[PDB]
């Protein structure tokens, strides 16, 4: 489950971090988003018929999804997403955005090449992946721990 | 930094010797696998990582992922029953880098995958092109032979 309250906190956590990066820009953020999608997808390992038991540990799957959510939030922030949009977007946590596991990669690249990345899809997909394959609370906990870590790493440099 | 048909034919035989040990081998999964290794390799370049002072993973890591991409490219070529005619005509497609520079290779790769899919020629071509343009052919072949040896030992 996900409230507008919770989503608003997520975006605030992301903004606090992104404000510490002067070179921050949407082009790189969108490329980075796509790359974390494949980092995540490579932890699920649906296609690896050469492994007896495919799939990396749950905490590893969640921490890449957390990475993907980070850039989705950042895109929505940098794009100046409005409350009006967020509130129309939450009742869409019951959509088939994550598609099915066998088509999600293909689908993802199609939407990217054709339509590009907008604030709504970039936010929606990692939340919707979490709702359908994990839990939203599992993702939020992974995400909060990761950003604290990211902050501690930025202090070093 | 040259590639002969003899060399390419040796790589294909190396790839088949490994793939014959994988009874679940199928084209659909190999194509998905190929796309994923592309992004594994792309993420070793870290060109987009403005939040890093010194972006880029070590050379051995970049080459190991480029070797993975060559592996699935060779595998796709093998499963598709690639012909001598096609290989000998493909080698003249080294030379011309054409397509991608570094700031566009991700978007270029995805465009091609979506619009054309993965064919025997393109999937084999790309990692050889990349080796020619950012590393050397020799470096990729050496990295590929080390990786496959590790792969076999892992299947043991
Ligand atoms: O502008 C940024 C940059 C990075 N980040 C965070 C998100 C994510 O947790 C992480 C992504 O950066 P990296 O790709 O460097 N980390 P990752 O763990 O994915 O390393 P790698 O790509 O090597 O697997 O940094 C932001 O939130 N905003
Ligand atoms: O059918 C196959 C399957 C795998 N392989 C080899 C190629 C490549 O070197 C490697 C790819 O399998 P993994 O993705 O499981 N290994 P990788 O190094 O990419 O690990 P990871 O995906 O976790 O980064 O196994 C084949 O040659 N044919
Ligand atoms: Mg990353
Ligand atoms: Mg990551
Ligand atoms: Mg891999
Ligand atoms: Mg790899």
Author numbering:
A (entry chain A): 4 to 160
B (entry chain B): 3 to 158
Quoted from the paper:
While all the staphylococcal S. aureus phages encode Duts; some encode dimeric and others trimeric Duts, never both. Importantly, dimeric and trimeric Duts are completely unrelated both in sequence and structure, representing a nice example of convergent evolution. While the 80α and ϕ11 phage-encoded trimeric Duts were initially described as the SaPIbov1 inducers (Tormo-Más et al., 2010; 2013), the dimeric Dut from phage ϕNM1 also induces SaPIbov1. We conclude from these results that dimeric ϕO11 Dut induces the SaPI cycle using the same mechanism described for the unrelated trimeric Dut proteins.
